[PDB]
């Protein structure tokens, strides 16, 4: 199988300006959203069709009354943090937590939060420890290092429940995140500025969106300059990306165990 | 959450030693708690497992086996005042606690 | 730390009554439990923070009120004799963390007759 992961995401804002919601917590598998949680709707809701027909209403609402309690707990932290830096006005309280599971079947489990978009506190399962940037990060890891038990019952939810759910969630939406659609590449050929020729090397339609794209010069790798285009959603659950370079060159692409060569 | 198993009743000697099952079968796992209840009385927190392991406060250990679902409370030294309810409660995937009916300890003078 | 009222009560069938709970612990989760013979405990109704409630296991024949994030009181619209049992009031700092253990208050004794 694939490498796959579980993600969740808690986003806090104080002071919201007219239309941007206090909280708002979403759940990712890979790249596709599976549900969400906002302060307004105050409500769990699926995000993908296979997590509704899969999970009956008992979950939504458990977790709703859950997600009601990790709002509050949100407030409280974010003015706490702003009482620390001395800080007024709107300021940001970021969390994310999740798993993966890869390809060797070994696992990966991360618990991280953010200040104003930038790292504040790092979980380290394998220590049970939280890592601070600075003194007030320091201040709220004294505190959470204290209760031992809440860092034990972390460790398991991140090396056992996250991976258990990921496995379960990947089980419902299998048709679309097991799937693989082949990408379809072209290479362009093209004299820009007087005396310069780039070679543009373009794949679109594939899923998912790992795709390794590479320009070789006669057989081994290119020392010149590479550009790279972002790998970006089409917007029918597709992708596509790119790579140039400028002037026995071929494009070398590999997606879900497929190697094509396009020589130019 | 599904299923809890603790044994009704239990009688030991005092000064001896006893030890309480616990079996569960729930959908997902959060932690294992014991409560001690009195007779007539509030039930007050024991100990939490959620790793496998012994942990030991006082005379009172408890165990935890995540792979065979099991948990024990064990007490050492038993004293008169350890008659009570041992009660057995575990956290499902959805933080639902899940309650066994709880053991009764009759301690022998 | 979790006061609830009250201890013991008689009541007919058919009559109303308000079973009161307070906790002075900033604890914001909250709940009510009826503990009945060889039966595990039964969450009546529960209250994961200040703002909001949720039916428990046995939500039937009552009803709850998160009055602020001190008290929790629970109702009994029209007392039957299946609701004769002992009534617990518990409280969490938080609900939705693993390790967060229950407080509970010193229970109350109900016996509806007819």
């Known amino acids: 199988m694939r490498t796959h992961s579980l993600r969740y995401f808690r986003l806090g804002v104080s002071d919201p300006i007219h239309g941007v919601p206090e909280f708002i917590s979403v759940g990712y598998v890979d790249s596709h959203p599976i549900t969400t949680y906002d302060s307004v709707t105050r409500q769990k809701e699926p995000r993908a069709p296979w997590m509704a027909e899969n999970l009956a209403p008992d979950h939504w609402e458990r977790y709703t009354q859950l997600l009601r309690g990790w709002q509050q707990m949100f407030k409280v932290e974010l003015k706490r943090l702003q009482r620390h830096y001395n800080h007024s006005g709107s300021h940001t309280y970021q969390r994310m937590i999740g798993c993966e599971l890869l390809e060797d079947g070994s696992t990966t489990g991360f618990l991280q939060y953010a200040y104003d978009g930038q790292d504040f506190l790092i979980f380290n399962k394998d220590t049970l420890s939280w890592l601070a940037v600075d003194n007030v990060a320091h201040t709220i890891k004294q505190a959470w290092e204290a209760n031992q038990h809440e860092l034990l019952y972390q460790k398991n939810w991140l090396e056992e429940e996250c991976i258990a759910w990921l496995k379960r969630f990947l089980e419902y939406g299998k048709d679309t995140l097991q799937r693989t659609e082949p990408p379809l590449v072209r290479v362009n050929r093209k004299e820009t500025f007087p005396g310069v020729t780039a070679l543009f090397c373009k794949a679109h339609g594939f899923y998912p969106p790992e795709i390794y794209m590479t320009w070789m010069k006669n057989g081994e790798e290119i020392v010149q300059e590479i550009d790279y285009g972002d790998i970006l959603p089409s917007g029918d659950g597709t992708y596509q990306a790119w790579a140039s370079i400028e002037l026995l060159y071929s494009c070398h692409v590999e997606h879900s165990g497929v190697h094509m060569v396009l020589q130019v | 959450g599904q299923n809890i198993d603790q044994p009704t009743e239990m009688t030991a000697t005092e000064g001896a030693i006893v030890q309480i099952n616990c079996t569960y079968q729930t959908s997902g796992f959060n932690g294992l708690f014991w409560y001690q209840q009195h007779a007539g009385e509030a039930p007050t927190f024991l100990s939490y497992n959620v790793l496998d392991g012994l942990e030991e406060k006082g005379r009172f250990s408890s165990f935890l086996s995540r792979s065979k679902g099991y948990s024990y409370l064990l007490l050492k030294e038993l004293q008169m005042k350890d008659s009570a309810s041992y009660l057995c409660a575990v956290k499902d995937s959805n933080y639902q606690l899940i309650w066994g009916a709880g053991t009764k300890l009759i301690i022998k003078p | 730390g979790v006061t609830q009222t009250p201890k013991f009560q008689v009541l007919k069938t058919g009559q109303s009554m308000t079973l009161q709970c307070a906790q002075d612990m900033n604890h914001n989760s909250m709940y009510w439990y009826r503990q009945d013979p060889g039966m595990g405990l039964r969450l009546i109704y529960y209250?994961?923070?200040?703002?909001?409630?949720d039916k428990g296991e046995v939500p039937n024949g009552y009803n709850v009120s998160r009055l602020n994030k001190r008290e929790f009181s629970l109702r009994l619209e029209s007392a039957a004799p299946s609701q004769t049992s002992v009534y617990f009031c518990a409280s969490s700092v938080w609900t939705g963390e693993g390790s967060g253990e229950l407080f509970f208050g010193e229970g109350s004794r109900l016996t509806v007759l007819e």
């Open positions: 209250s994961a923070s200040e703002g909001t409630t």
